Design a protein around this ligand. Structure first.
Ligand SMILES: [Mg+2]
Ligand SMILES: [Mg+2]
Ligand SMILES: [Mg+2]
Ligand SMILES: [Mg+2]
Ligand SMILES: [Mg+2]
Ligand SMILES: [Mg+2]
Ligand SMILES: [Mg+2]
Ligand SMILES: [Mg+2]
Ligand SMILES: [Mg+2]
Ligand SMILES: [Mg+2]
Ligand SMILES: [Mg+2]
Ligand SMILES: [Mg+2]
Ligand SMILES: [Mg+2]
Ligand SMILES: [Mg+2]
Ligand SMILES: [Mg+2]
Ligand SMILES: [Mg+2]
Ligand SMILES: [Mg+2]
Ligand SMILES: [Mg+2]
Ligand SMILES: [Mg+2]
Ligand SMILES: [Mg+2]
Ligand SMILES: [Mg+2]
Ligand SMILES: [Mg+2]
Ligand SMILES: [Mg+2]
Ligand SMILES: [Mg+2]
Ligand SMILES: [Mg+2]
Ligand SMILES: [Mg+2]
Ligand SMILES: [Mg+2]
Ligand SMILES: [Mg+2]
Ligand SMILES: [Mg+2]
Ligand SMILES: [Mg+2]
Ligand SMILES: [Mg+2]
Ligand SMILES: [Mg+2]
Ligand SMILES: [Mg+2]
Ligand SMILES: [Mg+2]
Ligand SMILES: [Mg+2]
Ligand SMILES: [Mg+2]
Lengths: 96, 67, 227, 106
RNA sequence: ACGGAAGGGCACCACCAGGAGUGGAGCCUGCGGCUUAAUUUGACCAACACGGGGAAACUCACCAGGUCCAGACACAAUAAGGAUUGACAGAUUGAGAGCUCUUUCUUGAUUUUGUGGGUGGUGGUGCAUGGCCGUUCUUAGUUGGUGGAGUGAUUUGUCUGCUUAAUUGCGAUAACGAACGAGACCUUAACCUACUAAAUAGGGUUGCUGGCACUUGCCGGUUGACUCUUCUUAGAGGGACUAUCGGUUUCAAGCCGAUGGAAGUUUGAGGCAAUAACAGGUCUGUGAUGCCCUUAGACGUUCUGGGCCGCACGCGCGCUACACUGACGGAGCCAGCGAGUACAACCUUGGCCGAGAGGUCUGGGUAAUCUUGUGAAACUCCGUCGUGCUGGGGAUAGAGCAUUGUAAUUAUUGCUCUUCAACGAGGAAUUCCUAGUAAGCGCAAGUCAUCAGCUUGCGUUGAUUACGUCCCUGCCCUUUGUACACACC
């Protein structure tokens, strides 16, 4: 997919700062939620990342659950050039 | 077409054979006895059991019967 | 959030269906059994009953965490207002869902169909169940379809005893030549079935009478009078 | 200084009965324990949520339908009761399934 | 398994006695055939108002065309002196499409062209499959463990009788104990002046008033007070178990009648509902799916328009009718299931307009609160009509007014005026049904932006005739015969 690099930057940076996406299956919608970009290339970008081996996908009731695996974290950190001591929001020990 | 299938007949037979001194001729007293001395799950089955128990009691009172 | 109460309950039910199917998709490798949705004044607790609880939690307790995040975005919840909880199944033998998933996994590894089915039945009856049954339908080593039936104990079929005691589970297994359909039925022990009836509808229990001695004819035994 | 009675109202919902009735009974017991005046757990007509559905997913076969339904029981309660004990009662004794809602109506 | 073989039992998807019908007519809808670019397709008791299939767009699957990649990933290849992307204006187009061209400008490694591979597919195969449902079969039928008989396939248990709706029981017994089915069980409908209670349900007394009567009474209004739960609700419970009695029964299972009852058909109605099976249907519900096909001008996806509705013709559900037990006017005025707006715009009261459809202004209702007492139709009372295809019938058309809709022509639908056709109770034949049942009558809900003549439910008025049989069509068990086992097709 041909994604302008700034919208792809938004996608990658959001996926990193928290770690998960839902991405309703309905294409052609104007804006994906909490991303302010088109849902279509959100879905396609996470599909490409999964094909890489960085995002585990899970389709159920059209809501494309996305989760970031460790090599995904490393790849995003190298791409986002953010310091190597910050982890996505999932890794935070928000336990019981 | 009321035939009172296996369960009620066997239960009433055991009821008579284990509790004849306490059983009576009356349906309501034997109904309370069935409630107290046996754990019948529903209440329609309890009523059928008490009714057949009363019938068997009446037959026994008339005379000695098989089984 | 204002909405009709009947519509609110329907939405709650469809949300529970949401959660159950999503967890079935995700935690299938975990021997998923069931999910409970408890609603408090502040938190929407979601208890997960699964076999591999420690793997469900994951390292440092992050897996559950990210799962929670998905829910918070699946239903537009708020942080803190929702929280997951992973619990071990009370007895993995009795839950037909877990057995169905486990023996689907066994089928996935090319294990013998008859051997896997009989092992499942044996384990279930070992758990204390009053009867188990498994239907394996599909292309069992032949082009023509056929259904194999394995059973032991007794399985009722009519009346809500079918709902009160026997629990069923249906699964699909993907092989290199087609799909196999798997149906698992377990009739739990009614005596141990809490929160409901504790016996079959026609199960009649008669209390054994106590034996007493009557011979004492006069027996005017006197207590000390009180006033 | 919350002596002003809020004439507060507690309403309930569920798709099941025994736990709903249990919650209502506990609410009434709590209300009587601290000497509160009330209108009892007034029963509301159980709304039957019904869908008819054709059984066959493909239209073939003899015409066979089915009806699925829940029942919703409401059993609202209102209290002419003090402030803090009432809110404590609402925030305690909660059972999954039964849904509690509170209206001040003051 | 079958018998135009026997015995014993059953069923209004059988009949008798009937009722209402359909088949005759218009129309609506679904098939076939024809036609067409397409008139998309699957079903042929158990296909045909069925796929929730009431499709104007979408739906969609068909047709004439126009777009785009929503071809991940790996490698090679170009390539940062441009891999590429996009576009004003014009030709082109149906388009205000940079689809394609004229010119040029913009854009930056996401891409582009080749290989592998992958996805998408209402593409094919239900004769590869799952799941589900239908049917065999609404009948009462199945099964294995020790034991007996057979060399054996198999058999007895599962039966001579009687009884039951029932392999339901009484029993007799090479059978004994058991399991599934039936029953039991849940929902629903009754009955509860017994309990708990209620300004989201009702009632009484008394206030504050209205009117009429004049005697202190009647019919009303008030969210003023006190009190109650008979009805209305819904929880725990009670109640019927063929209870008592009389007949009849190897006197046992049980049947028949009367009485008391609310209820005596299993109390009515259902929901689940066994073994075995069908090459029954569904890939067109599924991101359920194996294989095969396609994967760039695509069978992917989207846009425009058309079709799924055509019409020499046959058939299947129905609706309106052929009138006097009626049509049309007024007046009376009676329900029960429902449903109803939030990130959207639902149910609509009430007040003004319009003759109506409808319009407008406000106000309730996220619901025992408001629509709503859904003041519904049939029905009832008084009149007009008067046996005339007539004031029946309202199809087919002409014109106009509105609503939903981006869009209504191939009339969406509603309303107003007019033409008013066939239709005279419908052959052979054939369907459904034994009590609040059939039938008549409508209302609600699912389809729904608008549209039902459909279906699922609900209630109103409410019967004639059975209360039996194996004669037709079948079903269950037993006996017998068979040259049948793809099993009398
Ligand atoms: Mg049973
Ligand atoms: Mg049953
Ligand atoms: Mg017939
Ligand atoms: Mg006849
Ligand atoms: Mg007719
Ligand atoms: Mg006709
Ligand atoms: Mg005809
Ligand atoms: Mg056609
Ligand atoms: Mg049939
Ligand atoms: Mg239409
Ligand atoms: Mg189109
Ligand atoms: Mg179309
Ligand atoms: Mg085209
Ligand atoms: Mg598809
Ligand atoms: Mg397509
Ligand atoms: Mg088939
Ligand atoms: Mg059957
Ligand atoms: Mg043997
Ligand atoms: Mg036999
Ligand atoms: Mg009462
Ligand atoms: Mg007698
Ligand atoms: Mg019944
Ligand atoms: Mg076939
Ligand atoms: Mg396909
Ligand atoms: Mg059609
Ligand atoms: Mg039909
Ligand atoms: Mg009239
Ligand atoms: Mg009403
Ligand atoms: Mg009316
Ligand atoms: Mg005329
Ligand atoms: Mg007329
Ligand atoms: Mg009529
Ligand atoms: Mg229809
Ligand atoms: Mg009969
Ligand atoms: Mg032969
Ligand atoms: Mg012949």
């Amino acid at each position: 997919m041909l994604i302008p690099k700034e919208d792809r930057k938004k996608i990658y940076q959001h996926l990193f700062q928290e770690g998960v996406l839902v991405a309703k299956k309905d294409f052609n919608q104007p804006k994906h939620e909490e991303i302010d970009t088109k849902n279509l290339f959100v879905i396609k970008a996470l599909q490409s990342l999964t094909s890489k081996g960085f995002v585990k996908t899970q389709f159920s009731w059209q809501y494309y659950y996305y989760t970031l695996t460790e090599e995904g974290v490393v790849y995003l950190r190298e791409y986002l050039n953010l310091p190597e001591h910050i982890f996505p929001a999932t890794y935070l020990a928000g336990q019981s | 077409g009321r035939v009172r299938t296996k369960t009620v007949k066997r239960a009433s037979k055991a009821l008579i054979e284990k509790y004849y001194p306490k059983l009576t001729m009356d349906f309501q007293t034997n109904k309370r006895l069935c409630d107290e001395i046996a754990t019948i799950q529903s209440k329609r089955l309890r009523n059928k059991i008490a009714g057949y128990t009363t019938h068997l009691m009446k037959r026994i009172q008339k005379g000695p019967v098989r089984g | 959030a204002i909405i009709s109460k009947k519509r609110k309950l329907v939405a709650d039910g469809v949300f529970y269906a949401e959660l159950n199917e999503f967890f079935t998709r995700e935690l299938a490798e975990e021997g998923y059994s069931g999910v409970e949705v408890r609603v408090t004044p502040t938190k929407t607790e979601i208890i997960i009953r699964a076999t591999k609880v420690q793997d469900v939690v994951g390292e440092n307790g992050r897996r559950i965490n990210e799962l929670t995040l998905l829910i918070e975005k699946r239903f537009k919840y708020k942080r803190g207002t929702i929280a997951l909880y992973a619990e071990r199944v009370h007895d993995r033998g009795l839950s037909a869902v877990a057995q169905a998933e486990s023996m689907k996994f066994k089928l996935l590894n090319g294990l013998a169909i008859r051997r896997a089915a009989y092992g499942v039945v044996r384990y279930v009856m070992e758990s204390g169940a009053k009867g188990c049954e498994v239907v394996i339908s599909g292309k069992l080593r032949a082009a023509r379809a056929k259904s194999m039936k394995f059973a032991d104990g007794f399985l009722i079929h009519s009346g809500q005893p079918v709902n009160d005691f026997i629990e069923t589970a249906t699964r699909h297994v993907l092989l290199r030549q087609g799909v196999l359909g798997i149906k698992v039925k377990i009739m739990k022990d009614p005596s141990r079935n809490t929160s409901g009836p504790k016996a079959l509808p026609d199960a009649v229990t008669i209390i054994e009478p106590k034996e007493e001695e009557p011979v004492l004819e006069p027996s005017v035994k006197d207590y000390r009078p009180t006033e | 200084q919350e002596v002003v009675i809020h004439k507060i109202r507690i309403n309930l919902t569920s798709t099941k009965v025994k736990q709903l009735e249990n919650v209502s009974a506990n609410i009434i017991k709590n209300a009587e324990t601290f000497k509160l005046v009330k209108k009892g757990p007034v029963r509301l007509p159980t709304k039957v949520l019904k869908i008819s559905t054709r059984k066959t997913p493909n239209g073939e076969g003899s015409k066979t339908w089915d009806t699925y339904e829940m029942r919703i029981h409401k059993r609202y309660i209102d209290l002419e009761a003090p402030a803090h004990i009432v809110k404590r009662i609402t925030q305690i004794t909660i059972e999954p399934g039964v849904d509690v809602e509170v209206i001040i109506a003051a």
